[PDB]
Design a protein around this ligand. Structure first.
Ligand SMILES: Nc1nc2c(ncn2[C@@H]2O[C@H](COP(=O)(O)OP(=O)(O)OP(=O)(O)O)[C@@H](O)[C@H]2O)c(=O)[nH]1
Ligand SMILES: Nc1nc2c(ncn2[C@@H]2O[C@H](COP(=O)(O)OP(=O)(O)OP(=O)(O)O)[C@@H](O)[C@H]2O)c(=O)[nH]1
Lengths: 423, 103, 413, 103
């Protein structure tokens, strides 16, 4: 049974990480403030995939295979305040300065200083695994820690461990120096991550305002959407059962990534019903599947249907009221999708529902409209770089002017890859 | 098939090396008889990996109350002198395995 | 404006409360994670009956106390409800009650009693006008039954003038196992009978069936059963949150102190996947709608309360129904109708039926008989005997339940 | 979100360039409120391709009778000054799209 380690970097990363781990504890029946279970009981499911056991069953504990890194200490302090004795205190690493929204600080400056400690915690977590099946890196790329040190650590991870799958889950800024940091991070995510799942803050914002009626959505609201999707994607790895289709990170990325140069993914979730009504109001399978494949449901500001699908996985979990109907529906979708490069259409099923929906679905797709999201970013970068807006910020920090041109070109090489895949 | 008393529990279960599954049971319990033939199969297929023990709560009333047993049959998994997991009630030979596989 | 405190006890009790409080927050427009309402504007209705306020333009705090002898449910509520609850009112110990009434009543539950009573003292004092305490608990285990019985008794000894409503979840018959549950239930019933002012029953067997047959879930989760309870509870309390006190409500439902057990029903019972009023009323009164495994129409009604919620002809069909009910003849009867503008977040319009009905006896006699199956052979006797109870004491309590059944049997002429 | 009167219908709907969807509705209509949040999503996803308008039949009783409206909600698709298609009653956000896709 495969083990996964989740590394979270920076504000967004760690706040999402905290929400993810709380949800996963609740799914497995593990006390989210203490890592304990009721007297005599073991957690549900394949808990050892994401947790390790400490000591005897009496005073012992179930410990997230988690490492949290930041430069600014506020967010990790908050985790300590809200999460009791859940985490290994040695795995929550912070310093003192923030990176001040500067990618170069995280990659070359203060970031290089934190790396030996972070890498040493990775060593320890890795070795205490029966069989390590992947590492998930949770981060935003608009700031300077998640982007810079996220870039630094993925690179580092791949050099030292090589064969271990590394998936980035990366939050993108919504239309400051954010376009610069995004582009710089993208290079590493293109060259070194085995795959990168984007979470477009612009889309998340809209969904929270639109589908949920939140006039002024907060990051907590946006994190709910991400957490559901993360819980749902990881459910294949965290449960077993008579009907449960077990799927490793390895198997998943293999099916989602047809070439190393096309490894950027997007995702959609259903139901996007407001938490306000969550268990009282349910969608039937029809409306649910319909919604899953709707342009208004993707965690990306773009329209997958106007582009082409390179690959697709539908990850279902929970109650299955009518399997002939769901199969008929998915078969119909499979014949309706705009296609490229030969496609894959994978279907996963997990018996165990999440904690908020009786049944839910995550759609992961490798689709060419990701080019639109990426294009939006590059247009903003170019708008600032054409006039060298905050350029000295990065120049005085170790990057050279010509080398950032290389990274703007590197990202362009990735945007052209997906445009070529479409036509 | 390992039978236990209250006197033998300490050595047989708690001081034991390796994992051990204890079936708290009685003759007047319908569901307990249901799994008696099931428990024999596991005693074969988990050789070395597990030892399977039985404690009849009528003739040994002292042990179950110490472990917060709510009824019978109750399967308790011990590793050292510690309860790893708990299964209450009669079950399939397959659900029992998935329970043993994970812990 | 009368105040109500909710004291939830044990696993079931606290899981239900957690969902009760989230819902009630939403109904009042209070954020269930912070306790705050949209800036400037106030919460809807008679909020102070269930919440109390902290600052100014400030936070609303539930009149809630949660107790368990095991930490994990109360820890789940803490993880998932932000700064809503008063930290001093969430009380837990470590080892549980091991499904044993006696630990809850004589052992470890006796040790948490003072802290709990202290928090009650504080919530009772800060009330301008205390209208009632509600106790949510399952009575199949050791904590909700044993500690639940201990707290009820303590509360009536010290406060006495305060009405106590027990909302008791009864255990469904186990077929996979032989369990201590019948003993615990009968032991708790004695207290519910002698000390509580009323007891509203929720039969797990009926709730499962309602989830399986009416909600269409192949195999219902505990979470499905709790949602059934939550919406009934949201409905019962709606009359107090938008006004009538718990005391006025129990006065009309209870004609003699020896006949204070209640059943409830809900409409619409449509799957989570809009009905005419006449058919809603018709459904609300059907045998297959009650949250107990019995048929109310085949017994007699001592008293009835219908509490309609949401969006004339409504008065005509309720009148028609009144005249079709088999009535207890010498006991005084009542048929109370209530209307509340604000709807449940679940349904644009809905109804709860609360009823004092003699068919409760078939539910109770099912419990008594499962007990006798165990006690005939002193099945788990030493569990209880080696924890402070005597053999004679078990018999006394068994006889007390038999007397409860007999009461309702007599009420049915 | 475009609100209409009887006076503004001519210019806003009939003299309009490009396709337009009109929602004849009322406050006392259950099903009309049901699709109010749905219509907002289409106002986003069909930018340039469609404009979405609303006419409240109580405060503007003059227009609906001209188009043979049988009840509410009624969605009318206009292109020039002409009714392209008609949807009566509240519907899924998905059936609405398939309706918009084909016309
Ligand atoms: N979805 C979501 N986005 C967030 C969250 N927190 C911050 N963001 C977004 O993330 C981007 C900023 O990245 P941060 O993670 O906050 O910066 P950092 O690397 O952690 O910290 P510094 O380098 O010190 O600035 C912006 O686009 C924010 O809108 C969050 O909790 N959820
Ligand atoms: N309706 C409902 N029933 C429950 C729930 N949880 C447990 N039960 C039932 O309630 C009974 C057990 O009581 P609990 O409240 O769980 O346990 P407790 O007595 O309070 O605490 P312990 O004695 O330590 O075990 C069993 O018959 C279960 O079927 C719940 O969340 N909802």
């Amino acid at each position: 049974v495969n083990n996964t380690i989740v590394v979270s970097i920076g504000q967004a990363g760690n706040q999402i990480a905290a929400s993810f781990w709380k949800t996963v504890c609740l799914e497995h029946g593990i006390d989210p403030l203490t890592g304990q279970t009721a007297p005599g009981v073991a957690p549900r499911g394949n808990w050892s995939s994401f947790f390790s056991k400490l000591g005897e069953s009496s005073s012992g504990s179930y410990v997230p295979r988690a490492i949290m890194v930041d430069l600014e200490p506020s967010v990790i302090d908050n985790v300590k305040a809200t999460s009791g004795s859940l985490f290994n205190p040695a795995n929550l690493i912070s310093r003192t300065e923030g990176a001040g929204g500067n990618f170069a600080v995280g990659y070359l400056g203060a970031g290089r200083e934190v790396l030996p400690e972070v890498m040493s915690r990775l060593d320890y977590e890795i070795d205490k695994c029966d069989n390590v099946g992947g590492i998930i890196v949770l981060h935003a790329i608009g700031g300077g820690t998640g982007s810079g040190f996220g870039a630094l650590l993925i690179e580092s991870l791949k050099e030292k461990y090589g064969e271990i799958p590394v998936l980035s889950c990366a939050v993108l800024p919504s239309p400051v120096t954010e376009p610069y940091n995004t582009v710089f991070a993208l290079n590493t995510l293109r060259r070194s991550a085995d795959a990168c799942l984007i979470f477009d803050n612009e889309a998340l914002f809209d969904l929270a305002h639109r589908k949920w009626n939140i006039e002024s959505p907060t990051v907590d609201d946006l994190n709910l959407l991400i957490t559901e999707a993360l819980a749902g994607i990881t459910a294949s790895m965290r449960f077993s059962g008579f009907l449960t289709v077990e799927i490793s990170l390895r198997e998943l990325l293999t099916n989602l990534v047809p070439q190393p140069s096309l490894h950027f993914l997007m995702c959609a979730f259903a139901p996007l019903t407001p938490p306000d009504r969550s268990k009282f109001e349910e969608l039937g399978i029809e409306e649910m599947i319909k919604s899953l494949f709707d342009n208004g449901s993707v965690f990306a500001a773009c329209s997958p249907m106007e582009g082409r699908f390179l690959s697709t996985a539908v990850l279902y979990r929970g109650i299955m009221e009518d399997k002939p109907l769901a199969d008929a529906a998915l078969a119909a979708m499979r014949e309706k999708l705009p296609l490229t490069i030969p496609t894959a259409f994978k279907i996963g099923y997990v018996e165990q529902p999440g904690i908020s929906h009786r049944k839910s679905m995550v759609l992961l797709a490798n689709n060419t409209e990701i080019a639109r999201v990426l294009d939006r970013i590059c247009h903003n970068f170019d708008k600032l770089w054409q006039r060298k807006a905050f350029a000295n910020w990065y120049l005085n920090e170790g990057m050279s002017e010509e080398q950032i041109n290389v990274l703007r070109a590197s990202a362009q090489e990735l945007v052209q890859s997906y445009q070529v895949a479409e036509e | 098939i390992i039978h236990l008393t209250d006197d033998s529990f300490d050595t047989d279960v708690l001081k034991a090396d390796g994992a051990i599954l204890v079936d708290f049971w009685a003759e007047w319990c319908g569901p307990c008889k249901m799994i008696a033939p099931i428990l024999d199969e596991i005693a074969d297929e988990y050789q070395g990996k597990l030892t399977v023990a039985k404690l009849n709560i009528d003739q040994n009333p002292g042990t179950a109350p110490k472990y917060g047993i709510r009824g019978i049959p109750t399967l308790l998994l011990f590793k050292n002198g510690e309860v790893a997991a708990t299964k209450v009630g009669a079950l399939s030979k397959g659900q029992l395995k998935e329970f043993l596989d994970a812990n």
